[PDB]
Amino acid sequence: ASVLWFQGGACSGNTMSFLNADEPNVVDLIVDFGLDLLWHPSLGLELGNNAQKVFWDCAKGERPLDIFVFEGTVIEAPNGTGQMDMFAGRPMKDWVTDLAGAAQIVVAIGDCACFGGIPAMEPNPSGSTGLQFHKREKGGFLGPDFRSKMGLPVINVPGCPAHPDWITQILVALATGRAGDITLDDLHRPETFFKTFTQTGCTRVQFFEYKQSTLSFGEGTRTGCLFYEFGCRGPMTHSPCNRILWNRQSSKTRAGMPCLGCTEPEFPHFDLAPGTVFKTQKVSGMIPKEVPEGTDHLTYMGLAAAARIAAPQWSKEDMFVV
Amino acid sequence: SPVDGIRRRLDDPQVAEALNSLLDHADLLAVLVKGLDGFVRRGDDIANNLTSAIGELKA
Amino acid sequence: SPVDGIRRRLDDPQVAEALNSLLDHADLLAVLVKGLDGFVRRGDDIANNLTSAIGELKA
Amino acid sequence: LDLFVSPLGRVEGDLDVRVTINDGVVTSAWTEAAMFRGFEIILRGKDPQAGLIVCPRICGICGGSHLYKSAYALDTAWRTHMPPNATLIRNICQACETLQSIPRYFYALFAIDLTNKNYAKSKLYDEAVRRFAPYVGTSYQPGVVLSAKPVEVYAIFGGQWPXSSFMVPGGVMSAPTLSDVTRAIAILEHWNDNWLEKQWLGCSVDRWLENKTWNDVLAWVDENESQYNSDCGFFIRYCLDVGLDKYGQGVGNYLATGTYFEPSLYENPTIEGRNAALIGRSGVFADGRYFEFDQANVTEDVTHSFYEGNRPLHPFEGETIPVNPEDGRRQGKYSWAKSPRYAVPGLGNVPLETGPLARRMAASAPDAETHQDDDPLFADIYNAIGPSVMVRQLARMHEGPKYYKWVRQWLDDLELKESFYTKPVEYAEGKGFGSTEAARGALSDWIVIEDSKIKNYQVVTPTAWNIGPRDASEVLGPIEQALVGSPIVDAEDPVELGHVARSFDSCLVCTVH
Ligand code: FCO
Ligand code: F3S
Ligand code: F3S
Ligand code: F3S
Ligand SMILES: [Mg+2]
Ligand code: 3NI
């Protein structure tokens, strides 16, 4: 299975995260799983005209392209020319058009590629967009109706960056005959990773249940949930970040950092407008503006009051102790 | 225009009378919403008061 | 004109003060109406939750 | 022969290199950073801490460095207090990201070019291919695989790597537990034993750090078979055999902003107190002389960059106003990289090479305080054989043992019962300068907070220093001058251009942001 991994408006964080892959690690994925990595800007040996030969052979159908991985945004500026992202003699968006049209499967890795991500933040100087989404709005660069040659839409492996498993396990599934096991949600994300929430497996959910808030960073995060004071988007964000830990160690929320909802197409949420960074926007100083997914403010607040009343003593004390 | 129609409704003697009576008691509405804002902003305190009250009945 | 009269009431210092306080806590009113909209749009779910709860007490 | 190489990959982003070749030697070079995201534009008007989220996204491999310096930019802007544990965690995570970068870059990005057919006549070529071939090289696979371990340490403290924002004004978000520190130590020791010492060095880190002269390094290579056949010993021998010590010299002038604060010396971050608090010392090495780094001397020129502007701007007054590359090329602009220049007295606004070599030169400066990196090795190497692809790479690799030792000690220094965060006052106004040495060199944020919003946010990345285009005086950037003089055996595969550009560990996503 040939893989061509291109980077548009990328920071290469998805590649670096991918390189952190374990079980399989990246080398075993590239070699031992029958995935022929034709080229990758961070890893491909070919430069210049040899690299362009590889790209053109993929684009024109001279050689098969099974998986086109795209990382980074599709940069369309200036004026829709895409010249703020010139790659191998073309605007990167033209490469995207050709290769997405050539690939059996197109995988957008990372929010930039999936939805536009950080570069698509206003004022979006690069005219960045995702492959098939611009933020939540379906269509992105390739259009809502784009399908790869295997009939799939762009497989969106979101995250900023995506966790290595979010892509590697998909690649293994494709390589092991389990492509049919891959189900995609409405954002084209693999449901095997994105039916759960970041909160799922968060070490602070018991504090969340009892509405015990982390009050401060550092040692303050030895207790409490980050939802109330730090804008944790865990309960509104689909991800397996607390199921499949980052770097096989931790997750933002475990570590005391609020989930920024990076697997969600709106990321960065509120465009990091003043007062929204590591803060919970609240109505009347006590009602969160955004409640967990599938809850309403009325029920959520009633249950929150009940939980605060029922909260056991340990939920009010440090638990992630030295 | 639909906005023109809301201005047209505002002209209605009966609508106007009711809107005037609402603005006569707008202070009471303001105070009840302020009271609710207060209650909400002290909801944590009231929850701690109910926790200490239940905790007494527990002991 | 009756609409002119509502504009006249708006000028009133006390009416204005109350309307300003209402617009101060308008976020609370918005969130409570959004909470109600949420509760209504998930009313079927809450009804299914009460059905499963009563159905447990039935068994 | 005008040769346009596009893409020149394995530089973490979009790079094209134009070279004029005469008699098989590059006589002039243009580096063209080809991809622009405009994060400085995006950050304007955002939350003052938006940099902690956005700046790591400038780059995947060195986002932790971005986070480090953005956090310190806020710490200085807001006059925060940094608990020593927070400083230690920041140091540990910055250094761990660098320790990940060192092998990951060396094997995945740089050393595979050692398998180029241009070296087929070398007696070491078969071994070079066995070791460094992409994805199958016997040194490539363990080096790349184990490169993920140091950022496991990063994730222990920051939740994840890449893309944590856990370094915040006033400290870090996290509260390490005992098992966090013990596991971080175990991960670091395992990585050191299995890659750094077993594979890279073939000896202990201590034995390597005993090398104080170039002759010491050569004696170390020949000392025993383990060091001789180590990746380091083999790399040195390969460089000397194939001529990687003979080109890529570059400017010979270096900028290190330094990083790794001594916790007791930077508890209250200020711009003015920054240099004294550094462990990895700042320092400018220009015209064979040492100068103190001063951020006030930093300008960015956009004369040949795709930005509007007519004078070099100190980043506090920096602007990022893109021009259409078609128009810019009509004006002689050829790169999305700005041209960072440093005002050195008696030299004007000069290009300075950033990176591990710059750091090693800075570490060779006199008058090091006790907490500071005092290492004469690369002063001696610079005086003995001068800069080159080999020497630049050796500086990078030399940081491995040194930073490993620092990280191990910092992990021991953590006082787990003590604070990791002092809640700062989020002032509506402030001017912050945060700087660090990312793996590739001086990374700096100049932030201006006004009205509780980001008024200005200017990032100057190390590769911008290195790969930034000619300034208004047409003075080539460090990578451009390093390319000049490079032999070109095969214009169809001009691997020497790759050797020079990648010896800087060029990161083009950082270059442009
Ligand atoms: N290292 C690194 Fe990235 C670059 N250049 C930054 O800073
Ligand atoms: S990791 Fe980087 S490539 Fe985009 S998805 Fe996040 S900014
Ligand atoms: S339970 Fe965890 S995911 Fe966030 S909302 Fe609380 S810290
Ligand atoms: S910010 Fe992203 S990486 Fe996971 S913890 Fe939240 S979905
Ligand atoms: Mg900049
Ligand atoms: Ni980088």
One DSSP character per residue, D291-330 reads E---GGGEEEE-TTBTB--SS-B-GGG----B--HHHHHH
CA distance D502 to D505: 5
Using an 8 Å Cβ cutoff, are D162 and D410 in contact? no
A298 CA: distance to closest CA in chain C (Å): 5
Q: Which of D442, B51, D188 is nearest to A313 (CA)?
A: B51
Tokens describing residue A194: 């994105």
Tokens describing residue A266: 């709106």
Using an 8 Å Cβ cutoff, are A268 and A208 in contact? no
Using an 8 Å Cβ cutoff, are D104 and A19 in contact? yes
CA distance A303 to C49: 14
One-letter-per-residue 3-state SS of D98-142: HHHHHHHHHHHHHHHHHHCHHHCCCCCHHHHHHHHCCCCCCCHHH
**C18 vs B7: CB contact, 8 Å cut-off?**
no
Can you give the resolution of this entry in Å? 2.2
Residues of C in contact with A287 (CB under 8 A): 28, 31, 35
Number of neighbours of residue A33 by Cβ within 10 angstroms: 15
| D450: alpha, beta or left? (left if phi > 0; alpha if psi -120 to 50) | beta
B50 CA: distance to closest CA in chain A (Å): 7
What is the β-pairing status of strands A36-39 and A2-7?
A: parallel
| Cα–Cα distance list, D170 to A20, D32, D86, D252 (Å) | 30, 39, 8, 38
Show Cβ contacts of residue A251 under 8 Å, excluding neighbours closer than 6 positions. A198, A201, A202, A241, A242, A245, A259, D159, D160
Q: Which of D275, D278, D197, D267 is nearest to D231 (CA)?
A: D197
Number of neighbours of residue D380 by Cβ within 10 angstroms: 18
As to burial, measured by CB atoms within 10 angstroms (0-12 exposed, 13-18 middle, 19+ buried), residue B59 is exposed
User: What's the CA-to-centroid distance between D137 and ligand 1, angstroms?
Assistant: 26
Phi, psi of D100 (to 5 degrees): -70, -45
CA distance D368 to D371: 8
Residues of A in contact with B48 (CB under 8 A): 308
Expressed in angstroms, the distance from the first to the final Cα of chain C is 67
One-letter-per-residue 3-state SS of D181-221: HHHHHHHHHHHHHHHHHHHHHCCCHHHHHCCCCHHHHHHHH
CA distance D32 to D497: 13
CA distance D72 to D171: 9
| Cα–Cα distance list, B39 to A277, C28, C36 (Å) | 27, 11, 18
For B51, the closest chain A residue by CA position comes to: A309
Number of neighbours of residue C5 by Cβ within 10 angstroms: 15
DSSP for residue A212 = P
Number of neighbours of residue A61 by Cβ within 10 angstroms: 11
Using an 8 Å Cβ cutoff, are A22 and D148 in contact? yes
Show Cβ contacts of residue D88 under 8 Å, excluding neighbours closer than 6 positions. D263, D410, D411, D413, D414
Residues of B in contact with C3 (CB under 8 A): 7, 10-11, 16
- In the beta sheet, which residues pair with residue D256? D283
CA distance A72 to A10: 3
Q: Which of D273, D254, D257 is nearest to D265 (CA)?
A: D273
What is the β-pairing status of strands D348-350 and D339-344?
A: antiparallel
The residue whose CB lies within 8 Å of the most ligand 4 atoms, and thus the one to mutate among A236, A263, A276, is A263
Q: After which residues is chain C broken (C to N over 2.5 A)?
A: none
Number of neighbours of residue D226 by Cβ within 10 angstroms: 14
CA distance D351 to D470: 9
Instruction: Tell me which residue has tokens 């058009």.
Output: A97
Edge-to-edge order in the sheet of strand D254-256: D289-291, D283-286, D254-256, D353-354
Edge-to-edge order in the sheet of strand D339-344: D298-301, D339-344, D348-350
Q: Which of C22, C4, A284, C28 is nearest to B22 (CA)?
A: C22
Burial C20-55 (b: 16+ CB within 10 A, else e): ebbeebebbbebbebbeebbeebeeeeeeeeeeeee
Q: Which of D462, D454, D306 is nearest to A126 (CA)?
A: D306
Q: Which of D256, D194, D239 is nearest to D399 (CA)?
A: D256
D31 Cβ inside 6 Å of ligand 1: no
Instruction: Tell me which residue has tokens 């199958």.
Output: D136
Q: Which of A121, A265, A109, A254 is nearest to D60 (CA)?
A: A109
Show which of residues 225-244 on chain D sit within 8 Å of chain A, judged by CB atoms: none
Q: Is the peptide bond before D162 cis (omega within 30 degrees of 0)?
A: yes
**C3 vs B11: CB contact, 8 Å cut-off?**
yes
| Cα–Cα distance list, A53 to A17, A48, A91, D407 (Å) | 28, 9, 16, 44
- Describe the crossing of helices C13-24 and B13-24 by its angle, rounded to 10 degrees: 80
Helix runs in D229-271, H state only? 231-242
Ligand nearest to the CA of A213: 3
Q: Is the peptide bond before D150 cis (omega within 30 degrees of 0)?
A: no
Tokens describing residue D442: 């001086």
Evaluated on CA atoms A178, A183, A189, A193, the torsion sign reads negative
Phi, psi of D297 (to 5 degrees): -85, 0
Structure method? cryo-EM
User: What's the CA-to-centroid distance between D449 and ligand 4, angstroms?
Assistant: 27
Evaluated on CA atoms B22, B23, B25, B28, the torsion sign reads positive
Using an 8 Å Cβ cutoff, are A293 and A246 in contact? no
Helix (H, G, I), strand (E, B), or coil: what is residue A67? strand
CA distance D17 to B54: 74
D476 contacts chain A (CB < 8 A)? no
Residues of C in contact with A298 (CB under 8 A): 32, 35-36, 38-39
Q: Which of D47, D432, D430, D90 is nearest to A218 (CA)?
A: D90
Residues of D in contact with A17 (CB under 8 A): 60, 162-163
CA distance D374 to D362: 9
User: What's the CA-to-centroid distance between D458 and ligand 5, angstroms?
Assistant: 5
| Cα–Cα distance list, D394 to A26, D397, D400, D483 (Å) | 26, 5, 10, 18
Ligand nearest to the CA of D354: 1
D15 Cβ inside 6 Å of ligand 1: no
As to burial, measured by CB atoms within 10 angstroms (0-12 exposed, 13-18 middle, 19+ buried), residue D137 is buried
Q: After which residues is chain D broken (C to N over 2.5 A)?
A: none
Ligand nearest to the CA of A240: 4
Residue D270's identity, in one-letter code, is: T
Residues of B in contact with A284 (CB under 8 A): 36-37, 40-41
Q: Which of D8, D59, D19 is nearest to D464 (CA)?
A: D59
Number of neighbours of residue B55 by Cβ within 10 angstroms: 10
D77 contacts chain A (CB < 8 A)? no
Tokens describing residue A242: 């607390």
User: What's the CA-to-centroid distance between D312 and ligand 5, angstroms?
Assistant: 12
Using an 8 Å Cβ cutoff, are A167 and A107 in contact? yes
Phi, psi of A260 (to 5 degrees): -95, 10
Show Cβ contacts of residue D22 under 8 Å, excluding neighbours closer than 6 positions. D1
CA-nearest residue, atom 4 of ligand 4 = A241
Pick among A280, A282, A297 to test the C interface (most C CBs inside 10 A) = A297
Q: Is the peptide bond before A123 cis (omega within 30 degrees of 0)?
A: yes
Using an 8 Å Cβ cutoff, are D102 and D439 in contact? yes
Residues of A with CB under 8 A from a CB of C: 283-284, 287, 289, 291, 294-301
The residue whose CB lies within 8 Å of the most ligand 1 atoms, and thus the one to mutate among D70, D99, D338, D461, is D461
Residue D464's identity, in one-letter code, is: A
Using an 8 Å Cβ cutoff, are D152 and A245 in contact? no
Size of interface A-D (CB pairs under 8 A): 312
DSSP for residue D10 = S
User: Which residue among C28, C30, C35 places its CB closest to the CB of A298?
Assistant: C35
| Cα–Cα distance list, A161 to A276, D236, D434, D482 (Å) | 21, 35, 24, 33
Q: Is the peptide bond before D7 cis (omega within 30 degrees of 0)?
A: yes
Tokens describing residue D403: 């930073």
- In the beta sheet, which residues pair with residue A138? A133
Tokens describing residue D6: 């596009």
Q: Binding site annotation covers A241?
A: yes
| Cα–Cα distance list, D51 to A276, B58, D166 (Å) | 13, 49, 12
- In the beta sheet, which residues pair with residue D18? D4, D30
The tally of CA atoms less than 13 A away on the side-chain side of residue A242 is 25
Residue D394's identity, in one-letter code, is: L
| Cα–Cα distance list, A137 to A116, A145, C13, D293 (Å) | 10, 13, 46, 48
Q: How many residues belong to chain D? A: 513
Phi, psi of A299 (to 5 degrees): -60, -50
As to burial, measured by CB atoms within 10 angstroms (0-12 exposed, 13-18 middle, 19+ buried), residue B39 is middle
Q: Which of D340, D309, D302 is nearest to D444 (CA)?
A: D340
What is the β-pairing status of strands A86-87 and A90-91?
A: antiparallel
Pick among B12, B33, B40 to test the C interface (most C CBs inside 10 A) = B33
Expressed in angstroms, the distance from the first to the final Cα of chain A is 47
CA distance A117 to A266: 7
| Cα–Cα distance list, D453 to A24, A43, B52, D57 (Å) | 43, 39, 42, 20
Show which of residues 1-59 on chain C sit within 8 Å of chain B, judged by CB atoms: 1-3, 5-6, 9-10, 12, 14-15, 17-19, 21-22, 25, 28-29, 32
- Subunits that touch chain C (at least 3 Cβ pairs < 8 angstroms)? A, B
Show Cβ contacts of residue D445 under 8 Å, excluding neighbours closer than 6 positions. D51, D55, D66, D69, D70, D72, D73, D432, D433, D434, D435, D457, D458, D459
* Residues within a 6 A CB radius of ligand 3: A 198-199, 202, 204-205, 208, 225-227, 232, 234-235, 253, 259
Find the helix or strand (DSSP H, E) in which A5 lies.
strand A2-7
User: Which residue among C6, C25, C28 places its CB closest to the CB of B23?
Assistant: C6
B10 CA: distance to closest CA in chain C (Å): 6
As to burial, measured by CB atoms within 10 angstroms (0-12 exposed, 13-18 middle, 19+ buried), residue D209 is middle
Using an 8 Å Cβ cutoff, are A100 and A58 in contact? no
Expressed in angstroms, the distance from the first to the final Cα of chain D is 32
DSSP for A287-322?
EESSPSTT--HHHHHHHHHHHHHH--GGGGS--S--
Q: Is the peptide bond before A258 cis (omega within 30 degrees of 0)?
A: no
Using an 8 Å Cβ cutoff, are D86 and D170 in contact? yes
Residue D330's identity, in one-letter code, is: R
Residues of B in contact with C15 (CB under 8 A): 23, 26-27
- In the beta sheet, which residues pair with residue D278? D261
Show Cβ contacts of residue A180 under 8 Å, excluding neighbours closer than 6 positions. none
User: What's the CA-to-centroid distance between D94 and ligand 3, angstroms?
Assistant: 26
Residue D279's identity, in one-letter code, is: I
CA distance A283 to C33: 12
- Describe the crossing of helices C26-41 and B26-41 by its angle, rounded to 10 degrees: 70
Size of interface A-C (CB pairs under 8 A): 39
Number of neighbours of residue A35 by Cβ within 10 angstroms: 21
The tally of CA atoms less than 13 A away on the side-chain side of residue D432 is 39
Q: Which of D203, D206, D511 is nearest to D355 (CA)?
A: D511
Cα angle for residues A117, A120, A123 (degrees, 5° grid): 145
Q: Which of A266, A125, A223, A239 is nearest to A185 (CA)?
A: A239
Number of neighbours of residue A28 by Cβ within 10 angstroms: 18
D59 Cβ inside 6 Å of ligand 1: yes
Using an 8 Å Cβ cutoff, are D375 and D363 in contact? yes
Show Cβ contacts of residue C58 under 8 Å, excluding neighbours closer than 6 positions. none
Helix (H, G, I), strand (E, B), or coil: what is residue A28? helix
Q: Binding site annotation covers A58?
A: no
- In the beta sheet, which residues pair with residue D300? D313, D340
CA distance D441 to D356: 6
Using an 8 Å Cβ cutoff, are A109 and A71 in contact? yes
Q: Which of D375, D398, D383, D445 is nearest to D40 (CA)?
A: D445
Helix (H, G, I), strand (E, B), or coil: what is residue A238? strand
Residue D69's identity, in one-letter code, is: K
Pick among B15, B20, B23 to test the C interface (most C CBs inside 10 A) = B23
Q: Which atom of ligand 1 has the smallest separation from the CA of D65?
A: 7
Q: Binding site annotation covers A114?
A: no
Evaluated on CA atoms D38, D39, D42, D43, the torsion sign reads negative
Phi, psi of D427 (to 5 degrees): -65, 140
Burial D159-176 (b: 16+ CB within 10 A, else e): bbbbbbbbbbbbbbbbbb
For C34, the closest chain A residue by CA position comes to: A297
